[PDB]
């Protein structure tokens, strides 16, 4: 009764429409016949109004980071961002900032993933003949070191908010990939911690971070990529 209709300005761009220029389409969504988060408005516009709105979605609980976008000026997983029930505003749904768009809201993340691959995100042991035979021992105090660090969902919300990744994302790895590098470095079972550091000894891979700390705020998971990057720098100095 008395429907509440919120406006949603959403960044559109169609690759197949010749000469299409990025624009903003508005969709008044009724807030009573939809869920509470922003991904519920988007899935409603796609199932009931405009069946061409393209975005990535998969879990709808914020555990996988496919719905990462720029809602109201902040990189936040759309499945966990509540709709502002103040109906005098127009939500500004935008793709991740400074990233090539495949269609409307879907950014080209393949460089983000290639950079993740480049840091070697796997356990490296000097003696790998005993792999799979015995439970590598690790203390509860040495296992606590990886808290807040292994829970990254690789949603790029942090990397695409970093002004240094905007400018030099060709060579800078960004807060997410660097945080993961750190994670690996301080895994008590890894045996390449003085060789994972060596790989960052160029003026760009790690040393484009200047502690803007714009990655720790945007992290939808409440992690802290910039403190990780700081620990990495203190490890690169005090070997």
């Amino acid at each position: 009764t008395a429907p509440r209709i919120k406006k949603f300005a959403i960044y559109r761009w169609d690759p197949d429409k010749a000469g299409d220029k990025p624009h903003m389409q508005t969709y008044e969504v009724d807030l009573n016949k939809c869920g509470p988060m922003v991904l519920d408005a988007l899935i409603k516009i796609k199932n009931e109004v405009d069946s061409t709105l393209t975005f990535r979605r998969s879990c709808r609980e914020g555990i996988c980071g496919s719905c990462a976008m720029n809602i109201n000026g902040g990189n936040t997983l759309a499945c966990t961002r509540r709709i502002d029930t103040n109906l005098n505003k127009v939500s500004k749904i935008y793709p991740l900032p400074h990233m090539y768009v495949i269609k409307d809201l879907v950014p080209d993340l393949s460089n983000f993933y290639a950079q993740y691959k480049s840091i070697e995100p796997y356990l490296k042991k000097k003696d790998e003949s005993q792999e799979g035979k015995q439970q590598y021992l690790q203390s509860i105090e040495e296992r606590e070191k990886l808290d807040g660090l292994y829970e990254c969902i690789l949603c790029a919300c942090c990397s695409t908010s970093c002004p240094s990744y905007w400018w030099n994302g060709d060579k800078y790895l960004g807060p997410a990939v660097l945080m993961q590098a750190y994670r690996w470095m301080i895994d008590s079972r890894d045996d390449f911690t003085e060789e994972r550091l060596a790989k960052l000894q160029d003026p760009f891979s790690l040393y484009r971070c200047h502690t803007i700390m714009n990655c720790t705020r945007t992290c939808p998971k409440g992690l802290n990529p910039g403190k990780a990057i700081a620990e990495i720098k203190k490890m690169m100095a005090t070997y």
């Binding site: 169609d14 690759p15 197949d16 429409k17 796609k46 199932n47 009931e48 405009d50 069946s51 061409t52 393209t54 979605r57 998969s58 879990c59 709808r60 609980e61 914020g62 555990i63 996988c64 980071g65 496919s66 966990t80 495949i102 269609k103 409307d104 879907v106 993340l109 393949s110 993933y113 993740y116 691959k117 070697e120 995100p121 796997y122 356990l123 792999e131 799979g132 035979k133 015995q134 439970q135 590598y136 021992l137 690790q138 203390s139 509860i140 296992r143 990886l146 292994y150 829970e151 990254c152 969902i153 690789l154 690996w184 895994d187 079972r189 890894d190």
Partner: protein, 614 residues
């Protein structure tokens, strides 16, 4: 249709159609062995529904207390309701220790005990001393984020090998010639190009089909794609009718509240604030089979004990657990509960209701992952075709899956597919010359759907079946209604020709990717509703009111000495092999016998069917 779609042909040693836990384990196995593998995934690997899997892997590693893998075997067998293959159950429970060890040796951050070993917990259906004992501690958990850490460890660990991922490619059909499989034909979602990844061994690890139901804990991408590729290739499915409805799913969102929380001490309470898990499970109590607990929770509201404002859900109490335990082992459900239900686990209880969670059925495989045919009453192996994970039915779960056995399923049988491939084939085997128009029917269907002017939208045929299955194939079933459902589903299937799509582009046409996922969901729904209507017994998760008894070749409640062995055609202890004529949409149902002999009869003898009372 034709040259409006140029086809890019690839040749690999092995193709894995999936990048969940099972698909990643299998791709990693093949690539590590040496095979030129290719993972075709429609989601970035770490995007797979595996991530939604709070709750460790079961494994009989004896850290907390002396444990044996034979007790885990027994537990499994019993919880399956004797409709599981005790040879695949034997293999899995025997390889679970070494599988979780290899997983910890890859970097998976398992929670550690005071001695520096993997911290295990207690779930529903586990025991010690072949039941006679009490609750056991075998669940090797990564601090309530086990599926996330599994997926990330396996993916990053496959980056170490030449695993050529095809990320965001939709697999449309298998390339079957002369009864064997030569790979898959896939759709690149990014540019709309058709790709034919030819191989010598296909592993189908596509997950379940939970989106066949209105309310599900499952992702938007659980659409039964591999099960339907198998249906559209002339191969059967198996035990589709059995659908686990996890009891502890959020009332509104349908999110997961980890059966671990219960295993930690959490309790289920009705409107009267009583632990009804005693009247039903005097020993198992809260930690019981996810079929007994779900139906009991249904049989609390059915009789009017719902503690909801609308009286349609029960509470799960966790505030009686210390805050340190709540946040040290269950850090994820705290967030989930707060960010969705707004419930603070440390203060007020969480609203919970049974929603569709796991599909015990799927593609019939053996204990090696090899997909099975059924020709003249014999089990014939489809050459070059493997299945693993939720998509497969090796019947290690039978009628009911035990908690934490599904992640174990993924790792152990991804390993099984990889090991079987590396023992049956050599890296470099020349791919046979496939015909020059293989997979044309898939491209012609993709075209007929991209330019599908019609009447009924694709979102409406979904909601239609989703609510016809939520009403007619729910926890409790009855012929008089399972036939109304069969009718409704057959009719909605017929209406798959009156479909209307709006997006006519090629780049990221998700209206096409979703009409294709609806063609797969309607094939998994036809079979599940018909196998459920036909199964005139009550076993495991299939509970029928008009036949409230588990029929077996004997009356195992009574002594089986003077009993006459009921013929295979009468008793219902047999797997439902389902087929669908994809043109007419008619489902023919065959029946296969359950494999009882274990891998080594001397090692662990067959567990005789008994009265599965918890």
């Amino acid at each position: 249709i034709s040259a409006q779609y140029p086809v890019v042909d690839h040749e690999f040693d092995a193709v894995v159609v999936g990048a969940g836990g099972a698909g990643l384990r299998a791709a990693f196995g093949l690539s590590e062995a040496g095979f030129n593998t290719a993972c075709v995934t429609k989601l970035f690997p770490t995007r797979s529904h595996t991530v939604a899997a709070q709750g460790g892997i079961n494994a009989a590693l004896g850290n907390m207390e002396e444990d044996n893998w034979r007790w885990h075997f027994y537990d499994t067998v019993k919880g399956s309701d004797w409709l599981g293959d005790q040879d695949a159950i034997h293999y899995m429970t025997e390889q679970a220790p070494a599988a979780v060890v290899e997983l910890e040796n890859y970097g998976m951050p398992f929670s550690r005990t005071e001695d520096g070993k993997i911290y295990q917990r207690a779930f529903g259906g586990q025991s010690l001393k072949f039941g006679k004992g009490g609750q056991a501690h075998r669940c090797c958990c990564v601090a309530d984020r086990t599926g996330h850490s599994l997926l990330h460890t396996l993916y990053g660990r496959s980056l170490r090998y030449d695993t050529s991922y095809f990320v965001e490619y939709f697999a449309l059909d298998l390339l079957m010639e002369n009864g064997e499989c030569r790979g898959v034909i896939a759709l690149c979602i990014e540019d709309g190009s058709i790709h034919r990844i030819r191989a010598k061994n296909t592993v189908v690890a596509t997950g379940g089909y939970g989106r066949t139901y209105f309310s599900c804990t499952s992702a938007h991408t659980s659409t039964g794609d591999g099960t339907a590729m198998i249906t559209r290739a002339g191969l059967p499915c198996q035990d589709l009718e059995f659908v686990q409805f996890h009891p502890t799913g959020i009332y509104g969102a349908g999110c997961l509240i980890t059966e671990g929380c219960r295993g930690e001490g959490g309790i289920l309470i009705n409107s009267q604030g009583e632990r009804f898990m005693e009247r039903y499970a005097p020993v198992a109590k809260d930690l019981a089979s996810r079929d007994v607990v779900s139906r009991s929770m249904t049989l609390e509201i059915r009789e009017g004990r719902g503690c909801g404002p609308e009286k349609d859900h029960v509470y799960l109490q966790l505030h009686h657990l210390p805050p340190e335990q709540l946040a040290t082992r269950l850090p994820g459900i705290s967030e989930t509960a707060m960010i969705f239900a707004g419930v603070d686990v440390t203060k007020e209880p969480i609203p919970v209701l049974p929603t569709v969670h796991y599909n015990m059925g799927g593609i019939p495989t053996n204990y090696k992952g090899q997909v099975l045919r059924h020709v003249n009453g014999q089990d014939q192996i489809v050459p070059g075709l493997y299945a693993c994970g939720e998509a497969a039915c090796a019947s290690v779960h039978g009628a009911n899956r035990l908690g934490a056995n599904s992640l174990l399923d993924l790792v152990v049988f991804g390993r099984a597919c990889a090991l079987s491939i590396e023992e049956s084939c050599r890296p470099g085997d020349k791919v046979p010359p496939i015909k020059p128009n293989a997979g044309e029917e898939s491209v012609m269907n993709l075209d007929k759907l991209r330019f599908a002017d019609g009447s009924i939208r694709t979102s409406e045929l979904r909601l239609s079946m989703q609510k016809s299955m939520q009403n007619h194939a729910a926890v409790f079933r009855v012929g008089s209604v399972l036939q109304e459902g069969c009718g409704k589903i057959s009719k909605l299937y017929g209406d798959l020709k009156h479909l209307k799509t709006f997006d006519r582009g090629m780049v990221w046409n998700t209206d096409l990717v979703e009409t294709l996922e609806l063609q797969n969901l309607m094939l998994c729904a036809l079979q599940t509703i018909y196998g459920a209507e036909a199964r005139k017994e009550s076993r495991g998760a299939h509970a029928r009111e008009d036949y409230k008894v588990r029929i077996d070749e004997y009356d195992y409640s009574k002594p089986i000495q003077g009993q006459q062995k009921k013929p295979f055609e009468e008793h219902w202890r047999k797997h439902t092999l389902s087929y669908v004529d994809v043109g007419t949409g008619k489902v023919t149902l065959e029946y296969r016998p359950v494999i009882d002999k274990t891998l080594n009869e001397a090692d662990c003898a067959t567990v005789p069917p008994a009265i599965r009372s918890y």
